[PDB]
Amino acid sequence: XYXXXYX
Amino acid sequence: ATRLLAISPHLDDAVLSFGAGLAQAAQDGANVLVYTVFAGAAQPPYSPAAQRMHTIWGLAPDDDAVLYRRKEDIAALDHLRVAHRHGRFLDSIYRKLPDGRWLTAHVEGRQKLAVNDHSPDSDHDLVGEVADDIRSIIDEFDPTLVVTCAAIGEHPDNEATRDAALFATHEKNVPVRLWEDLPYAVFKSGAVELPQGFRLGSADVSSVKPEMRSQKFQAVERYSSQMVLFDRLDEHARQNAPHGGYGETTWPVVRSDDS
Numbered sequence: 249x250y251x252x253x254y255x
Numbered sequence: 256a257t258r259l260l261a262i263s264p265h266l267d268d269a270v271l272s273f274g275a276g277l278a279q280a281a282q283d284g285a286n287v288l289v290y291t292v293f294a295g296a297a298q299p300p301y302s303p304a305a306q307r308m309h310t311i312w313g314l315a316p317d318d319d320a321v322l323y324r325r326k327e328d329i330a331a332l333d334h335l336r337v338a339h340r341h342g343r344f345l346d347s348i349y350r351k352l353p354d355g356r357w358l359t360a361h362v363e364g365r366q367k368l369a370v371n372d373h374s375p376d377s378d379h380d381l382v383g384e385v386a387d388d389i390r391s392i393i394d395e396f397d398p399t400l401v402v403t404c405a406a407i408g409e410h411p412d413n414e415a416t417r418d419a420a421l422f423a424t425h426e427k428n429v430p431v432r433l434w435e436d437l438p439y440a441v442f443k444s445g446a447v448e449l450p451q452g453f454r455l456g457s458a459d460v461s462s463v464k465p466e467m468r469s470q471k472f473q474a475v476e477r478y479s480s481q482m483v484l485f486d487r488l489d490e491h492a493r494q495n496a497p498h499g500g501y502g503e504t505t506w507p508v509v510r511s512d513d514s
């Protein structure tokens with residue numbers, strides 16, 4: 249995992 | 256005299272997470288140095304993911320994005336009247352895996368980035384490198400206190416920064432604290448897994464004068480590239496210590512029993 253955004 | 260060493264993973268994280276603590280320390284006459292670990296100047300070509308990030312940040316995709324960031328960091332920290340030190344490690348988007356793959360891959364549709372699967376050996380090797388650099392800075396600057404990130408949000412660069420800082424400060428006998436990573440803490444649990452043998456103490460929710468919040472948010476706006484907000488941060492802070500002002504949550508880190 250990690251993963252960007254912005255949410 | 257108090258010498259505060261703040262260890263930021265990326266160019267903005269110390270100001271975003273701990274800008275009011277930096278501003279308060281400065282105000283109190285402390286000697287303050289923000290060392291940013293992943294401020295290494297990346298050499299092109301860039302990966303598809305980096306090139307996409309650069310364009311998201313308003314840059315030509317092949318532009319010197321780290322140079323642009325480093326200048327924003329100098330602007331933001333001079334606003335706070337605190338020193339900078341720009342370390343040599345490459346941001347996740349510039350790193351390669353030992354098998355040649357990019358560490359991070361671009362993913363279509365809002366997600367941006369995801370990290371490539373890889374062996375932990377290279378993550379452990381990165382920590383030892385970062386820890387060597389922190390030990391040298393501790394020898395040179397002689398901090399009375401180190402503050403770095405909790406790595407809430409599990410960014411691999413923040414986890415490496417945090418772990419390296421814990422090992423280095425334990426070996427050097429320098430107290431260390433972790434700040435709550437913003438904005439991640441607004442939307443993530445807050446629970447993290449520290450390296451074996453370390454544990455958090457009791458949280459401190461600071462209370463900062465509204466003047467210190469204003470100086471922090473002004474310094475945040477020097478990071479133009481990273482913006483396209485402040486309301487969210489405000490509500491998180493007031494939500495942390497109500498009947499209270501703005502503040503930032505930090506924890507001391509100590510050794511676990513039996514370790």
Ligand SMILES: *[C@@H]1O[C@H](CO)[C@@H](O)[C@H](O)[C@H]1NC(=O)CCCCCCC(C)C
Binds near residue numbers: 271346475
């Ligand atoms: C996202 O990961 C990138 C690749 O490692 C880093 O360059 C970048 O620093 C990372 N950003 C964050 O962790 C938080 C982004 C939200 C920042 C906007 C805050 C203000 C305007 C500076």
Ligand SMILES: *[C@@H]1O[C@H](CO)[C@@H](O)[C@H](O)[C@H]1NC(C)=O
Binds near residue numbers: 253254481482483484
């Ligand atoms: C995504 O992050 C950008 C980065 O500055 C931020 O300004 C914006 O508020 C975010 N978008 C959202 C939360 O929908």
Ligand SMILES: *[C@@H]1O[C@H](CO)[C@@H](O)[C@H](O)[C@@H]1O
Binds near residue numbers: 251255
């Ligand atoms: C933020 O990230 C996770 C993983 O993509 C989602 O489950 C969540 O709803 C939001 O998209």
